[PDB]
């Protein structure tokens, strides 16, 4: 199963913390979200807003994604996010991440109707 909308809910949502607790946040999340299962996911971002405050970006500003496709709506509000980024000492199975918290606009892709988001594109 796992609808691409679910893959998204799993891979990039954290409505509970409003900001990353420590510099040791990512190392856990990447683990408890199976991003370091087969190999270490190179990078991943988590958004700290409520889901509906995120599913609403699909009827917002329409922008072209990094790959030139047109279904990427960018949000107006600077949302509380977190950039997880593999460290130089990340030789899978041994995975390691550098946590950086930040508030930025988040562009995401939307697909279908219900026009839900299905891939995190970038922050600005």
């Amino acid at each position: 199963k796992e609808t691409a909308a679910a893959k998204f809910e799993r891979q990039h949502m954290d409505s509970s913390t409003s900001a990353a607790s420590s510099s040791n946040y990512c190392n856990q999340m990447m683990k408890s979200r199976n991003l370091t299962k087969d190999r270490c996911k190179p990078v991943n971002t988590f958004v700290h807003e409520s889901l509906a405050d995120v599913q609403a970006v699909c009827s917002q500003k329409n922008v072209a994604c990094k790959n030139g496709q047109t279904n990427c709506y960018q949000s107006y509000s600077t949302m509380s996010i977190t950039d997880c980024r593999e460290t130089g000492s990340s030789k899978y199975p041994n995975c390691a991440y550098k946590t950086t918290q930040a508030n930025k606009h988040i562009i995401v892709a939307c697909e279908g109707n219900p026009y839900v988001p299905v891939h995190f594109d970038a922050s600005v």
């Binding site: 691409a4 040791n24 856990q28 683990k31 408890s32 087969d38 190999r39 996911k41 190179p42 990078v43 991943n44 994604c65 990094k66 790959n67 030139g68 496709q69 130089g88 000492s89 892709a109 697909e111 891939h119 995190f120 594109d121």
Partner: protein, 456 residues
């Protein structure tokens, strides 16, 4: 047999069902569960009555200073013949460290201990070393990363070292000890009877000055297989100061980690005399370092000296551009020993990818892994990768995550994967966007040839 709740917030019923099993399990790994002091009480009790347990791992749990004290007391029974114990991120402060001495005394079975990510402070390390000394303590692998250990912690460790001959692995990474402390430590290591196999010191604050001291250890520790020195501004000088010991005929270092260490072209020149000299050096990271295309040109020359038998090379983010691919590729065609290549996060662009594709597509190539992660490859670049996938027989993995690839790109990759003679096994495409139409063809190709994984 092996308990393993991991990332499950344990229900009070599952904990109680579990309880009597704790006295039967050989291995327990209660990593990141709802564990607290409460659970620790039962763990402790159950710990003192289990005659077979050999590894306890109470990772990422707010066990705390109180809860750890009790869990510890569980291991404090004759019955307890544990050999590996981890309490990574267990919120243990230099306060709960009070029982470490009494504890290491009774466990001459313990061989592995992980205390990382715990704010032991130097006060915690101190008490930790009072146990490490007793002739009834014989630890082999010690890990103390992210412990808020300043340089004060170095003398008592230098001390633990001059007295031990057991330790095979030491990892103190991510503790601001500086140049002075590491010298106090480098000194102690020198006057030590042990034969280490692994030594790790990341973001520890060394300077070129400390390499001079390392030069000895490396040159003399014949049991040293991995030397992880990343995130330390040693720069070119330190490197230079470091080689005399690496050439040491008694050094068989297999893995040398040197990422984000301030090395530029100059330092590779010093390193290349090693690759040419050392048939024992196998893995080697240089990610982060601004080697540039010339740093590249350089390394290539020694991967051609057939006496160089290096297998895994990582240059993630090393300021390379298309201009190195002409060299990178030439090496690739003639080199019979290199199997893995991390070229990620380097602006190679479509043009760079292609020379690789042509080089690699020649007969007899050997590279099994090529990670072109984040190298500015577009839909038009998957077209070279496509022809590549058809003609090359050697490649087992191709990472291409984080590029400007879309539907037409994948589709061109699939054209080649869906064919019959394709030898690839994993195509790594994390963070790439494609639609249902494609995802179907994917879940579909992932149907025809199931022994080929396409990860994302």
């Amino acid at each position: 047999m092996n308990l393993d709740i991991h990332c499950e917030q344990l229900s009070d019923a599952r904990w109680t069902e579990l309880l009597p099993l704790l006295q039967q399990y050989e291995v327990v790994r209660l990593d990141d569960c709802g564990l607290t002091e409460e659970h620790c009480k039962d763990i402790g009790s159950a710990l003192r009555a289990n005659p077979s347990l050999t590894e306890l791992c109470l990772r990422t749990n707010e066990l705390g200073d109180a809860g750890v004290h009790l869990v510890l007391q569980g291991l404090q029974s004759p019955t307890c013949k544990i050999q590996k114990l981890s309490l990574q991120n267990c919120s243990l402060t230099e306060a709960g460290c009070g029982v470490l001495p009494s504890t290491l005394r009774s466990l001459p079975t313990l061989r592995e201990l992980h205390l990382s990510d715990n704010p032991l402070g130097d006060a915690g390390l101190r008490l930790l070393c009072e146990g490490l000394l007793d002739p009834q303590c014989h630890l082999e692998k010690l890990q103390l990363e992210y412990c808020r250990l300043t340089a004060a912690s170095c003398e008592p460790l230098a001390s633990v070292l001059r007295a031990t001959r057991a330790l095979k692995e030491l990892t103190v990474s991510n503790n601001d000890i500086g140049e002075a402390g590491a010298r106090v430590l480098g000194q102690g290591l020198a006057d030590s009877a042990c034969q280490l196999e692994t030594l790790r010191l990341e973001n520890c604050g060394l300077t070129p000055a400390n390499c001079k001291d390392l030069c000895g250890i490396v040159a003399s520790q014949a049991s040293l297989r991995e030397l992880d020195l990343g995130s330390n501004g040693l720069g070119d000088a330190g490197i230079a100061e470091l080689c005399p010991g690496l050439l040491s005929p008694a050094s068989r270092l297999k893995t040398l980690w040197l990422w984000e260490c301030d090395i530029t072209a100059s330092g590779c020149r010093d390193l290349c005399r090693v690759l040419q000299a050392k048939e024992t050096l196998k893995e080697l990271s240089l990610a982060g370092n601004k080697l540039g295309d010339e740093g590249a040109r350089l390394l290539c020359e020694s991967l051609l000296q057939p006496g160089c038998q290096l297998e895994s090379l990582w240059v993630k983010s090393c300021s390379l551009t298309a201009a190195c691919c002409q060299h990178v590729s030439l090496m690739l065609t003639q080199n019979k020993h290199l199997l893995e290549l991390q070229l990620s996060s380097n602006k190679l662009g479509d043009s760079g990818i292609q020379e690789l594709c042509q080089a690699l597509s020649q007969p007899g190539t050997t590279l099994r892994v090529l990670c072109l992660g984040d190298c500015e490859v577009t839909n038009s670049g998957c077209s070279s990768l496509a022809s590549l996938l058809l003609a090359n027989r050697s490649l087992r993995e191709l990472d291409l995550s984080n590029n400007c690839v879309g539907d037409p790109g994948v589709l061109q990759l699939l054209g080649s994967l869906e064919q019959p003679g394709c030898a690839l096994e994993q195509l790594v495409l994390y963070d790439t966007y494609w639609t249902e139409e494609v995802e179907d063809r994917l879940q579909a190709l992932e149907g025809s040839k199931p022994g080929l994984r396409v990860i994302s």
